[PDB]
């Protein structure tokens, strides 16, 4: 029996699935710790690894990558869970090792690979407190080339009156995603700031884990894939839409929750976004 995680229903993806919009032929790159391609509920189309000591991108020694992937595209079948865009062409771009960290050059190299291989959407459930001219250059190049770039806002919470949104989420070209729970309330760990763009479910998110398992995790990392998948559904319905049109639609059809410093434009509604 297959279970639909609350987050998928909360952003109204199932509505599009029933109309036949499930993200087919849309290439999504999960820049992360790799994806367990042997998972029964996932179908990885390709990828690459830029982690010198972990050359197989289809082997996830952390579990973060596979979990994020499950939210983006777990298969619509009779087992496990259901992704936001279950027909999406999932790519494993391994830039984080078994411990969950990665050097910025590995991350950047992964972004470059994604651009060169024409990914339609890039998901980055990662980030740090500092940026680099090289980091900004890679994400800005992606967008100029028509790629939709989504990134977790961070899990720094509030801090006086200043932004805690991390990089690359902080760059204007990158969509920054914070997390809310099932009640649409902001998760205390969610980063805040004028850079926040939109919110998506990010608490107790059930998804795939390596070794044919399932578990729930909480983090803006779990929030991000919901919007990456959202963009993919919009593109399956509107293949001619550019990345800036896909973003404006997601940003302009949100359910307003409080102040934008904390909730950005609000929770995404993929049904309304897809028009
Ligand atoms: Ca499934
Ligand atoms: Ca941004």
Curated annotation (Swiss-Prot):
Domain (Peptidase S8): residue spans on this chain: 5-274
Residues that, per the record, bind Ca(2+) 1: 2, 41, 75, 77, 79, 81
Documented EC number(s): 3.4.21.62
Temperature effects on activity: Optimum temperature is 48 degrees Celsius.
Top-level taxonomic group: Bacteria
Enzyme kind, highest EC tier: hydrolase
Note on how the cofactor is bound: Binds 2 calcium ions per subunit.
GO cellular component, one term: extracellular region
Other facts: Secretion of subtilisin is associated with onset of sporulation, and many mutations which block sporulation at early stages affect expression levels of subtilisin. However, subtilisin is not necessary for normal sporulation.
Family: Belongs to the peptidase S8 family.
Known partners and oligomeric status: Monomer.
Name of this protein: Subtilisin BPN'
Organism: Bacillus amyloliquefaciens
